[PDB]
Amino acid sequence: DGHKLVKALTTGTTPYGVAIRSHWQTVNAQNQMIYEDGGAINVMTSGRVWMLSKSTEAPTFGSAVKLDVDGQEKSDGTIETTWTYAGGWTKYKDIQLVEVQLHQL
């Protein structure tokens, strides 16, 4: 059918999508929202989504998205991605978030 098996991003790889909040969601040791090793995962491939970041400067509208090794937005990462920025930039409790527009690969 085309059903796919997915895992975390690594070096020299091609990003596919971004996991989103859903019913299937577990808690890590540090109270972090995670997807367990065995189970269903929802991946959104087109549209606007809030994504974790570890940058320190507000991104410019429309510029290309550059990812980090572990799969989070970073201002000068070495992984190239087709997605774009949408302009949203905010900060949850001790967490940085950024608004990313994803195009279908």
Partner: protein
């Protein structure tokens, strides 16, 4: 928040219920087979005239299977035709083995998939089954991917 799968896996039909688009205001010149790429040769009164893909053309969509419009088994000259311009669809192929996931497909003559090393265009979606001593693949069609040369 998930997308359902569609059951029949026959050539010429859609494979998923993701975002798709069907251009139903068209007519055919010549004969077309379900699951082949087509090209736009002209426009009359808001209607697009399509034909099977020649050498040197730019594909526009893929013929779509319907059980009322086409009672013969294929699309005939002078018939209204369904064409899929955006979405995942099962296509006829002459390849022998599945290409790399998310690669770029290349269309031989007659609108069949024969290449997996294109520069830009439609992409392989991960489905590869067997039909009639031949194979069927799953392609992801996007609207502005192939641009007509000036």
């Amino acid at each position: 928040y998930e997308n359902l799968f569609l059951r029949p896996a026959c050539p010429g039909n859609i494979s998923d219920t993701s975002t798709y688009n069907i251009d139903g205001a068209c007519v055919a010149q010549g004969d077309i087979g379900f699951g082949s790429a087509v090209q736009v040769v002209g426009i009359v009164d808001g209607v697009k005239v399509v034909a099977a893909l020649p050498d040197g053309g730019t594909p526009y969509g893929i013929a779509f299977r319907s059980q009322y419009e086409h009672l013969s088994g294929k699309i005939l000259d002078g018939e209204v035709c369904n064409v899929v311009s955006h979405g995942r669809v099962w296509t006829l192929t002459s390849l022998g083995e599945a290409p790399s996931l998310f690669s770029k497909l290349q269309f031989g003559s007659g609108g069949v998939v024969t290449g997996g090393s294109g520069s830009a265009g439609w992409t392989f979606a991960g489905g590869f089954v067997k039909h009639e001593d031949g194979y069927i693949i799953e392609v992801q069609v996007k609207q502005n991917a192939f641009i007509a040369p000036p």
